[PDB]
Structures are given as structure tokens and as C-alpha cells.
Amino acid sequence: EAPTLYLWKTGPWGRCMGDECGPGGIQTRAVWCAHVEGWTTLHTNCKQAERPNNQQNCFKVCDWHKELYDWRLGPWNQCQPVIKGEEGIQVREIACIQKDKDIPAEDIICEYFEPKPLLEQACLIPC
Numbered sequence: 001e002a003p004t005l006y007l008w009k010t011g012p013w014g015r016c017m018g019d020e021c022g023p024g025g026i027q028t029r030a031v032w033c034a035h036v037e038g039w040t041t042l043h044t045n046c047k048q049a050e051r052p053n054n055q056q057n058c059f060k061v062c063d064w065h066k067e068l069y070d071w072r073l074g075p076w077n078q079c080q081p082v083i084k085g086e087e088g089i090q091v092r093e094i095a096c097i098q099k100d101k102d103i104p105a106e107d108i109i110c111e112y113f114e115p116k117p118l119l120e121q122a123c124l125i126p127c
Helices: 107-113
Strands: 006-010 022-028 031-035 055-060 069-073 086-091 094-098 103-105 120-125
Touching: 055 107, 069 107, 094 107
Parallel strands: none
Antiparallel strands: 006 031, 022 055, 069 094, 086 120, 094 103
């Protein structure tokens, strides 16, 4: 279609910042424009319509949220080959759930309380 000279790049989200426990927090991240040849350039060289937000809403976590959220561990799926038994792996889904209303929430909430369990393990496929 059309060549690309400039693109937006983003750093990692900082910590959720708030006055109040719960919604209404703020994460900020670095956003800058770069030339495709790899150097930082003027922000006005990138298309502003494509400019990622340097801010997003977030949930300010406090100890008293512990009982309201938890990890839901989906079941291990098919043993996939890696290319007796032949080495393979299986994956599973893992989500943070607001327990009462039973709906998705951001991983970083459940993370504050318990580390995220693994999405992958080894498995053997029978000959």
C-alpha cells in the first residue's frame, strides 16, 4: 500500500495512581515518535490520529480487595508437539475475576495478592 517513515512507540505503563481505592486511578506511560531507521524524531512527524494515549484508567488496589478477586484457572488443553512418549506442551487460559458479579477484571488486580500461575506445562504424547 503506502510506505512507512514514522511510527509511534510506547514504554511500559507505570503504577496505578489514585487518591481512592478502586476505579478512577491513572497509569501513565511514555509515548514518542521514531523514524523507521531507528531514532527518536519529532512527535509531529507521526500521524496524530494514530497516537497512543499516554494515560489509561486503572483500579487502585488496596488490601481489602483481597476477597473480591481471584484467578480462575482454565483446564490444560491438548498436548501439542514441539517438532517412549514424544515431548509436547499444553497451555491454559487464566483470568482475573470479580467474584460477586463474575466478570473479567484486569490481571494486575489479582497480581497484587497472588502471582499469576503459569499458562504452560510440559506433557508427553503416547506413541
